[PDB]
Write a protein that binds this ligand. Structure first.
Ligand SMILES: C[C@H](O)CN(C[C@H](C)O)C[C@H](C)O
Length: 133
C-alpha cells in the first residue's frame, strides 16, 4: 500500500527529520490521509513535526530513527531555541508512553529526566520500546 518502496520507516515511527538550514527535528511518520494534501512521491514519507504539528514531505534518506538520540540531538539548538525544547518534550513524552516508562514529578525540570533517559539510550527498554502499537 503506502510507503511500499523498499525504503525505511513506516506509519507511526518516531524520527529525526532534516530540513534545509535547520537542525534535525523530531517527527512522526504519518500517512498521507492525515495531511489533507497528497500521496508522498515514491521514496518520500509524510511526517508531522513535534511542537508545531505541521506536515512535511521528506526523503526517507533525510530521516533517522529518533532512538538514535545522542547522534542527532543538537545541544546548541536546544540551548538557543525554546521551540526545540518544546519539540523535545512532546517527542520524548510520546516515547515515554510507548516505552512503558515513567518519571517522578516546570518545563526545564520536566525535560531533565526525559532528556537523560533519551540521551542514555532509552533504558531499560532500549530503542525497541519506541515502536508504535
Ligand atoms: C518547529 C518549527 O516547525 C521549526 N522548523 C522551521 C520551519 C521552517 O517553520 C520546521 C521543522 C520542524 O524543521
Amino acid at each position: 500500500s503506502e510507503y511500499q518502496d523498499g525504503k525505511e520507516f513506516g506509519i507511526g515511527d518516531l524520527v529525526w527529520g532534516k530540513i534545509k538550514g535547520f537542525s534535525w527535528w523530531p517527527a512522526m511518520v504519518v500517512s498521507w490521509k492525515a495531511t489533507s494534501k497528497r500521496q508522498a512521491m515514491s521514496g518520500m514519507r509524510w511526517v508531522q513535526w513535534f511542537g508545531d504539528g505541521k506536515f512535511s514531505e521528506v526523503s526517507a534518506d533525510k530521516l533517522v530513527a529518533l532512538g538514535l538520540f545522542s547522534q542527532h540531538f543538537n545541544l546548541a539548538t536546544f540551548n538557543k531555541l525554546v521551540s526545540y525544547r518544546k519539540a523535545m518534550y512532546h517527542a520524548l513524552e510520546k516515547a515515554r508512553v510507548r516505552a512503558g516508562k515513567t518519571f517522578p514529578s516546570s518545563l526545564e525540570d520536566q525535560l531533565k529526566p526525559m532528556l537523560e533517559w533519551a540521551h542514555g539510550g532509552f533504558k531499560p527498554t532500549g530503542i525497541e520500546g519506541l515502536k508504535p502499537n
